[PDB]
Amino acid sequence: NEKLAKKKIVSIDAGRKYFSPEQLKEIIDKAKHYGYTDLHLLVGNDGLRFMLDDMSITANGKTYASDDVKRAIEKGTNDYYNDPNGNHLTESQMTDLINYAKDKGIGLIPTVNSPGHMDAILNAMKELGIQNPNFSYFGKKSARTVDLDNEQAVAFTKALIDKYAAYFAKKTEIFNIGLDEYANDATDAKGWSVLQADKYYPNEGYPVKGYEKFIAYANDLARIVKSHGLKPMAFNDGIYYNSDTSFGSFDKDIIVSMWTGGWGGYDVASSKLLAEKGHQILNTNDAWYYVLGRNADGQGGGNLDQGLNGIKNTPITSVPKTEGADIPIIGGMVAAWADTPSARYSPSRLFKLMRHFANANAEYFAADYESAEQALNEVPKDAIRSLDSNLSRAQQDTIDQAIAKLQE
Amino acid sequence: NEKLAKKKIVSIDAGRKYFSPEQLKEIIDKAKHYGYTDLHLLVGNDGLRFMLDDMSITANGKTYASDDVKRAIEKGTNDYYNDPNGNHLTESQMTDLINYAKDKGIGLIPTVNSPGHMDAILNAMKELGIQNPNFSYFGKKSARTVDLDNEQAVAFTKALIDKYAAYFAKKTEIFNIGLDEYANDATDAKGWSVLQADKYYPNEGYPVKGYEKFIAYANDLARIVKSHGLKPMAFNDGIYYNSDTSFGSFDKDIIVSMWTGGWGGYDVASSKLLAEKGHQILNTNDAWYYVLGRNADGQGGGNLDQGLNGIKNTPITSVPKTEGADIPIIGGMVAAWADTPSARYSPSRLFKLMRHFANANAEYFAADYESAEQALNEVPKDAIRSLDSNLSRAQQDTIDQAIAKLQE
Ligand SMILES: CC(=O)N[C@H]1/C(=N/OC(=O)Nc2ccccc2)O[C@H](CO)[C@@H](O)[C@@H]1O
Ligand SMILES: CC(=O)N[C@H]1/C(=N/OC(=O)Nc2ccccc2)O[C@H](CO)[C@@H](O)[C@@H]1O
């Protein structure tokens, strides 16, 4: 069935906040249990929390030694938030995690975010001797965003992505380069307008070729990822921002994680425009968002009850900003975020979100056969087998009737 | 139940195209059958197809005689499209239609559109001696939109709305003043930007206080409608366009028919902003749109199969441009339109749309008790009664099992 063949993805922000391999395996088990197909794991998102064994970087006519890069990144991340739970996943842990997921039929999609949400990398680059990597807006320095005029900072960042992409090659299918929310701290969430401004309002102090350079940067990352046999993904907001096609084009192989329909003064391209350009669309509707430590109404945007309500009200098939058109999607992604990374991670709350997303879109999620397997095993060792292995969660109680056997 | 208490509305464009009282009663019967609560009947929308017995209008220090107004409007409408099926509903027919609907528990919501989509009224005003009522944009004259600088044209239009509102008083609850798509012909669908332009780009030939005057106009119509005990409704696109609150405010009693999340260069306010301003929201998602004579993919926007797919993919609870927030709604409205008014009206196609909207949102629509009543009557005259009169279409087959009795 076509619905069941879609991707159903849970997203976890292990960039801002540390998650242990054990916690992540537990998430993987629940994902499999509920009919999900993939774990989307941000490891670079403000913080950078995945260290390769060899972190040496060649860029700028030199090689930054592995030990030096590791030190700079570890500290860069800790300056953002020194998490008492841990700093980073190691390469051994990631290889094991990917294999553990794969053995269960769960794929892994990493994110290493740039040119925004890269606090730790910027911090690292500074320690390594790269001057003024940060974008500044009229005196206000972005903590999270690289200046695209800074050739050395850009070359280092590209080489770091390439290094990660070389690792994830053959172990994974998709690599999310991110691209969301350029200089959102320094511009009060007006980054794309700011990058486009100089073209239409010249000689006013706006970044010359700002957006043009962003386009070139995004496409170069896309080529880098694809050179390792990987499909690039990115968040939608900066992609043909304001529906403006006059700055250049985006590479069609960029899968768009469509998370926002925009807001006042933040006029993103519709998913209709993006799909018509040829981009595949992953529905990542922010109606479903959950930010750790926000549980009920009044606790702010992305609170759990808001996310659970978005899940109930806005199904997997309902994409942001469609113009009423029929947008084809590769599937849908529900996202948990750690904006305040010191908040306590609650497995039960995350699984409640995941369960609700699966149950509210039951025809899209493979039925739970684990329960049935478990029951057969619990039969003293001294229907179920014949029911087709292709039901959805919508037909779940069928299976739960066959487990209601128990006696004989 | 809260879901069942929502409004579920079918919209019919009897402004562009003539619909007979008989056709409309048939629509009302189907609406009741499927669990709808209201018929939204545009009678002024490009064409004007409802004539009051007394059409005399006092404005501009004079009274335009009823017979003169009737002649001008009838011709104005025919110049738009002289429909061989008929020109207008009469007052007797409308009073009967409203009563017929009311007796069945179906409300009627009329639309008389302005200051856009008012071809016939503009045509009429010209015949009646009002000079240059039409908005022009750099030489290009709008056929559909009144110039808000034209005091006499504005005063006549306001008085016509007041006349209709006086008629609909006590017979109805809501009056839709429309307000969609200002000068969409003459500006290539850029009307709101055009009205706002002079404020930010002065001395360039843009309408001085264009949007400011639109705001005053909308609010005056709102006061007029409310003076007859009616709640005003309007389409969302012109309401705080571009999320700009610096031109003035909209009256909070304006219920917003939220039909569009906007598109490239057409940056409407989010339903989040509108709801936070205090506006009640009627979900009128254009994903569900059906334009008569467009049946399959490739036949253009609003084709039937597109509407049926929008209905399947986007439920009644999914509002345009929410910013991911929980938007409260008074209910939802599915709309059939006659953009090409010479297209053949197909009852079966319209009922298919209506049926699908009801079945795709089954928990919102009152169950069909008419079938059960019919069966009891067909019992030779020489369970059903006890099942609660409060089920939704989701529990329909319960009732259809009780009708599967038939024999004894
Ligand atoms: C692509 C994305 O979601 N980026 C940021 C992001 N941006 O969201 C907004 O700018 N606004 C918003 C916040 C909560 C829910 C919906 C939209 O949302 C997440 C939750 O706050 C952040 O953790 C992400 O880093
Ligand atoms: C409020 C509204 O819908 N206005 C016009 C309207 N505006 O729609 C658009 O501008 N674009 C559009 C067309 C079809 C489906 C969705 C959006 O849609 C209807 C169907 O074309 C027209 O009949 C209406 O007059």
UniProtKB/Swiss-Prot annotation, chains A, B:
Family affiliation: Belongs to the glycosyl hydrolase 20 family.
Subcellular location: Secreted, Cell wall
Region (Catalytic domain 1): 1-408
Organism of this sequence: Streptococcus pneumoniae serotype 4 (strain ATCC BAA-334 / TIGR4)
Protein's UniProt name: Beta-N-acetylhexosaminidase
